Structure formats: C-alpha cells, structure tokens
C-alpha cells in the first residue's frame, strides 16, 4: 500500500528572519520530518535556549509543532534575552538536522 | 486536476505557505487536501463567512500579524481535525457566538495581542482538548463565571496584560487559579485600588468583593 519506515530528520520549514517590537509576541518556526517524530532544540548564538519544557517559568514556549513561541519580546535598556540569531536542531535515533539561521531583531 | 496553489504562495505536501505576501484576503480555491494554511504577516482585515469550512483536513491555521477586526461566526465551521488556531497580533475586539463551535480537536488557541473586550461564557464550549489558551494582552476587564468549565484538558493559560476589575464577579477566577495553577503570565488586578497591580493568583478569594 505504502509503508512509512523509520527515517532520520529533515527540516522542511526553516525559521525565518523576524523583526518585532518590545512587548509583542513572536514565533520562530521549525518543521522537521522524521520517524520517530524528531525532538526539537533551539540555540541562540550557539547556546541552548531554555523554554517552558526545561523551565515551566517562562515567556518562551516550545510548541508541539517545534515552534519557539515568545509570548512577549523582552528588550529593556540593560536586559535583552531574546534578540539574536537562532537555529533549531531536530533529532531522532537515526540522526539530526540543523536549520538555517534566523535573526530575531527588535525594532 | 487543475491548479490549486495561489502563485503568491508555495504548496508543499499539503502545507500552503502564503506568509508575508501583502495579501488582503484569504486565497480561495486551495487544495482540498490542505493540512496547514500559513497566512501570517499579511494585511487581511476580515475573515469571511465559512472561510475555512471547505478544508476538512486542516490541522493548523495561522493568521497571526494581520489586521483582523472581524471574523464570521461560521469561519471555522465543520473542521473536526483542527489542532492549532493562531490569531495573535490582530485587532479583534469580540468573538461572535459559535466562533469555536465544533472544534473538539483544538489543542492550541492563541488570541493574545488583540483588543478583545468581552468573552462569551460559551466561547470555549466545545474546547475539551484545548491544552494552551493565550488571552495575554487584550482588553478584558472581566471573565464570566463558567467560561473555563469546558476546558477539561487545559495545561497552560496566559491571562496577563488585561485590565481586570477584581470585584465579586472575578472571585471564581481567584478560586479557579488557586485550584488550577496553570496561568503562567502573571494576571493582575487593575482595580479596585486595594488590589491594583496584585497578581490574581496572590490574592485571597475573600478580597474579591462588590
């Protein structure tokens, strides 16, 4: 008929550059195919991003789609945890896929 | 078949991506097999009668960052597979009766960053599988008792950046939030003076008085 065998991850939607203002919501998307369903991790400037799934205390959520949802962009005079260049990595037992960069910039 | 992919969009494996294309209306005549429609960052003002009803395999509708001020009550009528509806960053002031009727499968509903000034007690009547509800950054002064009763699967809620009046009519919410510690954004009273700037979750229920 048409079987789906296990296969390693492939990014089918890369995050895209985003311009946002302080206090506004933002999403960076990351759709990966793979079986078993790949798990998604986010990195900002090469450093792993903490989300509700690593800390329940958060303005950042990792949604079941793999998307990184910012309920509100934090950008104070002297505190800027959200602006940066992001990559998502999708993993399953057969391999991993790394997305293109996406810049999250505050206007 | 004939062509069912709008030229402004790309259609890949039933995902239709129309983001950031300066669209003022939802493209019509999409593939009947569509599972995801991505319309974020356009200039759509109105969601017309039965807009999404034909697309029975839709799992995800993203309309974030448009200019939506009006949605037809039957815009999502007859969708039984819809998993995620994202509407944040629009200009929505009210949700008509029946807007979310029949969305039994819905798991994610992002309504944050609008101008919603009132919610109907039946607004989420059928949303028994909803896991995340975001109402953050709207114009709600109250939520009617019973509005959250249908939300049997709810895990996370955002209610903050709403000008709540923490009187007797919001007492149920203090109770609700003490029994269900699922509100993560820090919902706060705007009035009365005694409760101004205090998290609803931090206030003893007795203090909610008319």
From Swiss-Prot, chain A:
Glycan-carrying positions = 101
Give its localization.
Cell membrane; Cell projection, Axon; Endoplasmic reticulum-Golgi intermediate compartment membrane
Post-translationally, this protein is described as follows, namely:
Ubiquitinated. May be deubiquitinated by USP33.
Which ranges carry the Ig-like C2-type domain? 9-105
Q: List S-S links within the chain.
A: 30-88
Q: Quote additional remarks.
A: Maps within a region of overlapping homozygous deletions characterized in both small cell lung cancer cell lines (SCLC) and in a breast cancer cell line. The promoter region of ROBO1 shows complete hypermethylation of CpG sites in the BT-20 breast tumor cell lines, some primary invasive breast carcinomasa and some primary clear cell renal cell carcinomas (CC-RCC).
Q: Which disease is it linked to?
A: Neurooculorenal syndrome: An autosomal recessive syndrome characterized by variable clinical features including congenital renal anomalies, neurodevelopmental defects, intellectual impairment, cardiac defects, and ocular anomalies. Some affected individuals present in utero with renal agenesis and structural brain abnormalities incompatible with life. Nystagmus 8, congenital, autosomal recessive: A form of nystagmus, a condition defined as conjugated, spontaneous and involuntary ocular oscillations that appear at birth or during the first three months of life. Other associated features may include mildly decreased visual acuity, strabismus, astigmatism, and occasionally head nodding. NYS8 patients manifest bilateral horizontal nystagmus in the absence of other neurologic signs or symptoms. Brain imaging is normal.
Function text = Receptor for SLIT1 and SLIT2 that mediates cellular responses to molecular guidance cues in cellular migration, including axonal navigation at the ventral midline of the neural tube and projection of axons to different regions during neuronal development. Interaction with the intracellular domain of FLRT3 mediates axon attraction towards cells expressing NTN1. In axon growth cones, the silencing of the attractive effect of NTN1 by SLIT2 may require the formation of a ROBO1-DCC complex.
Record's subunit section: Homodimer. Dimerization is mediated by the extracellular domain and is independent of SLIT liganding. Interacts with SLIT1. Interacts with SLIT2. Interacts with FLRT3. Interacts with MYO9B (via Rho-GAP domain).
Give the UniProt family note: Belongs to the immunoglobulin superfamily. ROBO family.
By what name is this protein known?
A: Roundabout homolog 1
**Gene giving rise to this polypeptide:** ROBO1
From Swiss-Prot, chain B:
- Domain LRRCT span(s) in chain numbering: 162-210
UniProt repeat feature LRR, residue ranges: 33-54, 57-78, 81-102, 105-126, 129-150
Q: Tell me where in this chain the LRRNT domain is found.
A: 3-32
Q: Name the cystine pairs.
A: 9-18, 166-189, 168-210
Q: What is this protein called?
A: Slit homolog 2 protein N-product
The record lists the organism as Homo sapiens
């Amino acid at each position: 008929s048409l079987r789906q065998e296990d296969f390693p991850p492939r990014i089918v939607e890369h995050p895209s550059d985003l311009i946002v203002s302080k206090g506004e919501p933002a999403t960076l998307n990351c759709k990966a195919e793979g079986r078993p369903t790949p798990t998604i991790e986010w990195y900002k400037g090469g450093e792993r991003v903490e989300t509700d799934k690593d800390d329940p205390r958060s303005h950042r959520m990792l949604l079941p789609s793999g998307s990184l949802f910012f309920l509100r962009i934090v950008h104070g005079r002297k505190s800027r945890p959200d602006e940066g260049v992001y990559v998502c990595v999708a993993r399953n037992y057969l391999g991993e896929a790394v997305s293109h960069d996406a810049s999250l910039e505050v206007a | 078949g004939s062509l069912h992919c709008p030229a402004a969009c790309t259609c890949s494996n039933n995902i239709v991506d129309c983001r950031g294309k300066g669209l003022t209306e939802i493209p019509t005549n999409l593939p009947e097999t569509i599972t995801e429609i991505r319309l974020e960052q356009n200039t759509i003002k109105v969601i017309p009668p039965g807009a999404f009803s034909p697309y029975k395999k839709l799992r995800r509708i993203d309309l974030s960052n448009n200019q939506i001020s009006e949605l037809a009550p039957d815009a999502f009528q007859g969708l039984r597979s819809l998993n995620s509806l994202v509407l944040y960053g629009n200009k929505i002031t009210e949700l008509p009766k029946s807007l979310f009727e029949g969305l039994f499968s819905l798991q994610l509903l992002l309504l944050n960053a609008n101008k919603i000034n009132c919610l109907r007690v039946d607004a989420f009547q059928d949303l028994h599988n909803l896991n995340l509800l975001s109402l953050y950054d709207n114009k709600l002064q109250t939520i009617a008792k019973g509005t959250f009763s249908p939300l049997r699967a709810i895990q996370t809620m955002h209610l903050a950046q709403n000008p709540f009046i923490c009187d007797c009519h919001l007492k149920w919410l203090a109770d609700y939030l003490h029994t269900n510690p699922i509100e993560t954004s820090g919902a706060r009273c705007t009035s009365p003076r005694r409760l101004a700037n205090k998290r609803i979750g931090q206030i003893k229920s007795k203090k909610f008085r008319c």
